[PDB]
């Protein structure tokens, strides 16, 4: 759970980076 724990934190960041591009995709189409 030591390594997996730190990796699990990054997983959440993904939802944020993809949510950003999602807003732009709407602009284009």
N, CA, C and O of each residue as an XYZ file, in Angstrom:
116
protein
N       0.842     -1.224      0.000
C       0.000      0.000      0.000
C       0.864      1.256      0.000
O       0.362      2.364     -0.191
N       2.164      1.077      0.215
C       3.094      2.198      0.237
C       3.197      2.839     -1.142
O       2.878      4.015     -1.315
N       3.644      2.057     -2.122
C       3.780      2.544     -3.489
C       2.410      2.779     -4.118
O       2.149      3.844     -4.678
N       1.539      1.777     -4.022
C       0.192      1.874     -4.576
C      -0.525      3.117     -4.060
O      -1.280      3.757     -4.792
N      -0.284      3.453     -2.797
C      -0.915      4.623     -2.208
C      -0.558      5.903     -2.937
O      -1.437      6.693     -3.282
N       0.734      6.111     -3.174
C       1.201      7.301     -3.871
C       0.667      7.333     -5.300
O       0.302      8.390     -5.814
N       0.628      6.163     -5.931
C       0.135      6.044     -7.297
C      -1.362      6.333     -7.368
O      -1.852      6.872     -8.360
N      -2.082      5.971     -6.309
C      -3.524      6.185     -6.259
C      -3.853      7.672     -6.229
O      -4.920      8.091     -6.677
N      -2.930      8.464     -5.698
C      -3.117      9.908     -5.615
C      -3.074     10.540     -7.001
O      -3.858     11.437     -7.311
N      -2.152     10.064     -7.829
C      -2.001     10.575     -9.185
C      -3.240     10.282    -10.025
O      -3.615     11.074    -10.890
N      -3.869      9.139     -9.763
C      -5.067      8.740    -10.492
C      -6.118      9.845    -10.460
O      -6.816     10.079    -11.446
N      -6.222     10.520     -9.320
C      -7.185     11.597     -9.182
C      -6.829     12.794    -10.041
O      -7.710     13.468    -10.576
N      -5.532     13.058    -10.172
C      -5.058     14.177    -10.975
C      -5.472     14.000    -12.433
O      -5.739     14.976    -13.135
N      -5.523     12.748    -12.880
C      -5.912     12.434    -14.249
C      -7.292     13.000    -14.565
O      -7.500     13.611    -15.613
N      -8.229     12.790    -13.646
C      -9.593     13.279    -13.815
C      -9.613     14.793    -14.002
O     -10.530     15.338    -14.616
N      -8.598     15.465    -13.468
C      -8.527     16.912    -13.573
C      -7.945     17.387    -14.889
O      -8.382     18.399    -15.436
N      -6.957     16.661    -15.403
C      -6.318     17.036    -16.661
C      -7.232     16.733    -17.845
O      -7.212     17.445    -18.850
N      -8.032     15.678    -17.723
C      -8.954     15.294    -18.784
C     -10.196     16.175    -18.757
O     -10.837     16.391    -19.785
N     -10.529     16.681    -17.573
C     -11.690     17.546    -17.415
C     -11.413     18.914    -18.023
O     -12.332     19.624    -18.433
N     -10.135     19.274    -18.076
C      -9.718     20.551    -18.639
C      -9.883     20.537    -20.153
O     -10.464     21.453    -20.735
N      -9.365     19.487    -20.782
C      -9.458     19.335    -22.225
C     -10.909     19.171    -22.655
O     -11.292     19.571    -23.754
N     -11.710     18.579    -21.777
C     -13.122     18.362    -22.054
C     -13.835     19.688    -22.307
O     -14.707     19.781    -23.170
N     -13.453     20.708    -21.545
C     -14.052     22.032    -21.682
C     -13.683     22.670    -23.019
O     -14.480     23.401    -23.606
N     -12.472     22.389    -23.493
C     -12.000     22.937    -24.758
C     -12.665     22.242    -25.939
O     -13.017     22.881    -26.930
N     -12.834     20.928    -25.826
C     -13.465     20.146    -26.880
C     -14.833     20.725    -27.218
O     -15.271     20.681    -28.368
N     -15.501     21.266    -26.206
C     -16.814     21.868    -26.390
C     -16.701     23.138    -27.223
O     -17.567     23.434    -28.047
N     -15.625     23.883    -26.998
C     -15.380     25.121    -27.728
C     -15.233     24.842    -29.219
O     -15.871     25.490    -30.049
N     -14.386     23.872    -29.550
C     -14.153     23.493    -30.938
C     -15.401     22.868    -31.554
O     -15.764     23.175    -32.689
N     -16.053     21.990    -30.796
C     -17.262     21.321    -31.264
C     -18.086     20.805    -30.088
O     -19.145     20.211    -30.290
